[PDB]
């Protein structure tokens, strides 16, 4: 149950954590050995994971997938690629944290799940938020620079961590705009 969860959160599923495209990650919900109390916590922990997998799939889907081969801002574009380059670097601390937990588990052979909940619970809030930034991009087929504004309106976020988190991405995306403006001018 312990190393197994880190494997799942890291983004590779296992029988105890059944990936369903509709259900993201889902516990079997029935193991006589484990009482119902720990189940809910796992589900809660799974949510962070459900988002980790979706993000990677999307980043993989539009980033480096082709050597620039009806490509359009929703489908593709130098800006769309820039959003992906940033999304993975903003998610980097989550990777470092998961890595660190293992070192402690290597350090001690009996650490409760609650201990896991405490260390990963700062990400429990940043990940859901970043989700809408992307979700708006896909539905509205936001094209080209219009993406630069879509994040900026969510730059007024009421969570200080999220604000810093998204701000990093705009800095990355501006780089390209500054890059294209670097020529026509």
């Amino acid at each position: 149950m312990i190393h197994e969860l880190l494997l799942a959160l890291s983004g590779y599923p296992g029988s105890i954590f059944t990936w369903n495209k509709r259900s993201g990650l889902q516990v079997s919900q029935d193991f006589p050995f484990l009482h119902p109390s720990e189940t809910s916590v796992l589900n809660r922990l799974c949510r962070l994971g459900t988002d980790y997998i979706r993000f990677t799939e999307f980043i993989e889907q539009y980033t480096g997938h082709v050597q620039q081969q009806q490509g359009q801002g929703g489908l593709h574009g130098i800006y769309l690629r820039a959003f992906c380059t940033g999304l993975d670097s903003v998610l980097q601390p989550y990777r470092q944290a998961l890595l660190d937990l293992e070192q402690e588990f290597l350090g001690d052979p009996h650490l409760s799940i609650s201990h896991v909940n405490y260390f990963l619970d700062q990400f429990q809030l940043l990940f859901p938020s970043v989700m809408v930034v992307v979700e708006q991009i896909k539905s509205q087929k936001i094209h080209g620079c219009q993406i630069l504004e879509t994040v900026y309106k969510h730059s007024c976020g009421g969570l200080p961590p999220v604000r810093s988190a998204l701000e990093k991405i705009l800095a990355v995306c501006h780089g390209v705009m500054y890059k294209q403006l670097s020529a026509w001018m």
Binding site: T39, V41, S112, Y118, C156, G158
Partner: protein, 314 residues
């Protein structure tokens, strides 16, 4: 007499159950919840406990259980887990502060759990119950700030009415606990931390308007609602950069209490800056703050504003 069947749970198992419940968890076999009401499970017995006394202590923990649950349900609702462009901007600042308080509480409960699992040290129901007594002191106050600030009017239709009120159940109840005593200094330091991270939105909006010269808000959160600002500048009161005529009022609309002393200066620096154009306020309060002195603490916030009005309007 007929004996009734009971589970015979161990006293050690009960401690693990409460620590999970005191933190956010649902569907625990003990403290079964039915309708937003956590209630002691009907049948649990222990070797060294009579059914009635165990019911008494457990029901007593479950009551604290109902408060932490309701706060967890609110935090959940406005975390993004769920209109089109309606960032309330104050409920988000309040829940975020509430979350910071819930992180530290969940960690003390983690330490108690670690000792319970891998040691020969005796931890029993009475030891932990009295160990948490400072955290249980904080929860009863926190439930009160919430049950008035967000639960005073259950339909809760208007949006300006909700934000002004919450900033006014926090500026009001901090004065209430200000002169209570100097014994614990716990309740006030907690309420004050909720206050700074719930006014952070309003003081971002004020500073943006005092030098950028554009009042900028959604959900009509601010108290000087610029309802008449859309078409007035075509006219060149008629200058309603702040149509306070539709903003603050005694009854139809509302004004937050802390800003009444400096309200007149803000509007007039605000209009002045916008006319001057047609040709770090949160990060200044916190620095001066870091050096019963509650009203005097709010006195050190004003000179930052008096400087802007004296310079810009001049």
């Amino acid at each position: 007499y007929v004996p009734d069947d009971r589970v015979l749970v161990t006293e050690t198992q009960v401690i693990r159950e409460t620590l999970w419940l005191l933190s956010g968890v649902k569907k625990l076999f003990i403290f079964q919840l039915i309708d937003g009401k956590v209630t002691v499970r009907n049948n649990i017995i222990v070797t060294h406990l009579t059914h009635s006394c165990l019911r008494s202590v457990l029901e007593q923990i479950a009551a604290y259980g109902q408060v932490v649950f309701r706060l967890q349900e609110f935090i959940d609702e406005v975390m993004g887990h769920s209109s089109t462009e309606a960032p309330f901007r104050t409920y988000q600042a309040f829940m975020w502060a509430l979350y910071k308080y819930f992180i530290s509480f969940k960690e003390e409960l983690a330490e108690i759990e670690k000792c319970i699992i891998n040691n020969d040290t005796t931890i029993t129901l009475a030891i932990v119950v009295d160990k948490l007594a400072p955290r249980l002191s904080q929860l009863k106050v926190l439930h009160k700030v919430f049950s008035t600030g967000v639960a005073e009017v259950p339909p809760d239709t208007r949006n300006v009415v909700r934000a002004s009120h919450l900033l006014n159940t926090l500026y009001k109840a901090i004065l209430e606990y200000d002169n209570v005593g100097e014994a614990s200094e716990q309740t006030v330091s907690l309420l004050f931390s909720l206050w700074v991270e719930t006014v952070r939105p309003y003081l971002q909006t004020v500073d943006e308007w005092i030098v950028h010269g554009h009042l900028w808000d959604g959900a009509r959160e601010f108290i000087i609602q610029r309802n008449k600002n859309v078409p007035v500048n075509h006219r060149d009161n008629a200058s309603a950069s702040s149509g306070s005529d539709q903003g603050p009022s005694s009854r139809q609309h509302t004004m937050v209490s802390f800003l009444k002393p400096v309200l007149k200066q803000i509007i007039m620096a605000g209009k002045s800056m916008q006319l001057l154009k047609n040709l770090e306020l949160d990060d200044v309060h916190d620095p001066l703050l870091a050096i019963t002195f509650e009203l005097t603490l709010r006195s050190c916030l004003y000179p930052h504003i008096d400087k802007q009005y004296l310079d810009c309007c001049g």
